[PDB]
Structures are given as C-alpha cells and as structure tokens.
Amino acid sequence: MADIGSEFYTLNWQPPYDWSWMLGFLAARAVSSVETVADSYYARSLAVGEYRGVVTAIPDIARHTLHINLSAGLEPVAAECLAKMSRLFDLQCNPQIVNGALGRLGAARPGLRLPGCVDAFEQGVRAILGQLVSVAMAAKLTARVAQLYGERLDDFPEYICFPTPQRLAAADPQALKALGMPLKRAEALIHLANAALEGTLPMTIPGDVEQAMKTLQTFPGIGRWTANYFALRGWQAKDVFLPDDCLIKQRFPGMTPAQIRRYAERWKPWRSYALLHIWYTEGWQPDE
C-alpha cells in the first residue's frame, strides 16, 4: 500500500460520519481486482472520459476530511474524480438537516450516509447482477464479469476498470450466462449497456426522479425494486423509498406495501436516508 500518485487532495465533510460503517458496507460489495477496501482505506480503478488511473480515499476523522491520492493519468481530470469520490461517499450531506427531519429514526446511527457510486452504468450492472443473490455471491459474479470484459491498467496491472458500455453491450449473452447467471439476466445487462451508448440511461440524477424510474421499469430484468435501489445508489436520489423491500415489511408487522408508503410520507424529502436507518438500525420499531 504505497502511494499510487504524487498528487494528493483534501475533501472536507460535515460531522458526524460513521466511516467504520461506510467502508464496512463498501468492502462487502468490493469487486475483486477493481477495488480494494480495508480499515480506513478505499482504492479503486477509475475512468474519466479518455483518462485512466487509480484513486485512493483515506478518511481523517479528527480533521474531519478525506484524503485523496491520484494516479498520474487522472491529474487532468482531478476535479471530476473528486466529484465521483464525493458522490460515492456522500460528502455534501448535511447530517443535521437530515437527522432532525428523521427524528427518532436517526437518533441511533446519525453517522449513516448514502453509499453512492463512481459511475451510473457500473451501478446499473450491479443492481441487476446482485438481484436475487446474496451480497457476497453478487460480488464474486461481478468479479468474473470484470475479469472477462474489464480493461487492465497500463500503469497498474493489478487493477482493471469496470467494463464499459461498449464491450459489455457487444457481449455474447451465452458467455455471460456461463459465468453464473440466468439468460434473461445476461440480457438485462446487454439491454442496459445498450441504453448507455444511446443516451437512453441517464448518467446523472435527472430532473424528475419518479418519472425516470417509470421509464426504467420498462426495461427487461428491471422492476420497481431494482429500479428504486438503483436511483438510490446510482443517482444518489435522497428521496426514495422501497415499501416493497422484504426487510421493510418485516419491520412493519401487519401492514401493506401501501400502508407504509403513506407512513414513510412523514420523512419527505429524506426518504432514502430514512430507508437506510431502518435497515441498519436493529432495535427500531415503527410508531404504531
């Protein structure tokens, strides 16, 4: 773990912030050879247009900042790399504004953030591949895919970039199925990879979120759930709620996928942060 570049950068963040949990979360989904997560370490390959390189992020709890290191090939697009790190880490969040608006739901784990992404397509691939399988199973699968269609780095051979919309769209649906997924899933990927090149998949948080999710569910392999959990991680939409998630219903013993949609109305417009708390806050029981 030597420095991978000579340039370093500093990103300020608003306390509190549970880094233990963030990097915890990101390490369980870490795609082997694409990214490496450790104690207070996060590194990963990164493409920014034509430019390729390695980015590492190390939190500094005391000075409340995040230290960033960049491969020499990412220098010219540093500003945009820093925006990806920001979006991946949810740095611009105002915990007080959110946590106040969550009330009791926020009290236990105020350091929770919205784990984002570095790329809207990559997230799209993920949301699908991790659809019906365990968190861990989904990461091995994605490793194998990247292994196949991922481009290696000329300056850092250990790392490969997540496969682009190009070499993914133009992939033998049968080659993908042979990596450990149904055929109808190898096709969702391809239909996505496709939507990417023809600007049919919004690569940034669009104006009308709800409207852009309707449009998504019309894709193959993508339903209400897969399209919500994408808006959350892919666009970092902060006002999204999945009343249909298996774990949430269990938290609302005796309540319909419609009697909670109006319960989680009370957390507008921070419903994504509300959802997370609900998951990772164990002893939380709804106000009956």
Partner DNA sequence: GCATTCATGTC
Partner DNA sequence: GACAGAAGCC
The contact set with DNA (CB under 7 A) reads 131-133, 181-182, 184, 217, 219-227, 244-246, 250, 256, 258
Alpha helices in the chain (DSSP H): 19-29, 78-89, 95-102, 120-129, 135-149, 165-169, 173-177, 183-197, 209-217, 224-234, 246-251, 271-280
Distance of CA 154 to the CA centre of its chain: 26
Residue whose tokens read 């109808």: 184
Q: Which is nearer to DNA, 16 or 257 (CB)?
A: 257
CB 140 → DNA: shortest distance, Å?
13
DSSP string, 253-267: SS--TTTSTTTGGGG
In the complex with DNA, the residue whose CB is nearer, 8 or 279, is: 279
Q: Please tell me whether the peptide bond between 16 and the residue prior to it is cis, using omega within 30 degrees of 0.
A: yes
Tell me how far apart the alpha carbons of residues 101 and 222 are, in angstroms, rounded to a whole number.
31
208 catalytic? Reply is: no
Question: By C-beta, is 93 or 181 nearer to DNA?
Answer: 181
Q: How many CB atoms lie within 10 A of CB 253?
A: 9
Residue 83: what residue type?
Answer: A
15/182 with CB nearer DNA: 182
Please tell me the number of Cα atoms within 13 Å of 193 on its side-chain side: 20
Kind plus residue range of the DSSP H or E element containing 152: strand 151-152
Peptide bond into 110 cis (omega under 30): no
Measured from the CB atom, the residue of 70 and 129 that comes closer to DNA is: 129
Q: Mind spelling out the 3-state secondary structure of 55-111?
A: EEEEEECCCCEEEEEECHHHHHHHHHHHHHHHHHHCCCCCHHHHHHHHHHHCCCCCC
DSSP state of 16: -
Between 58 and 222, CB nearer to DNA:
222
- Residues annotated as catalytic are 245
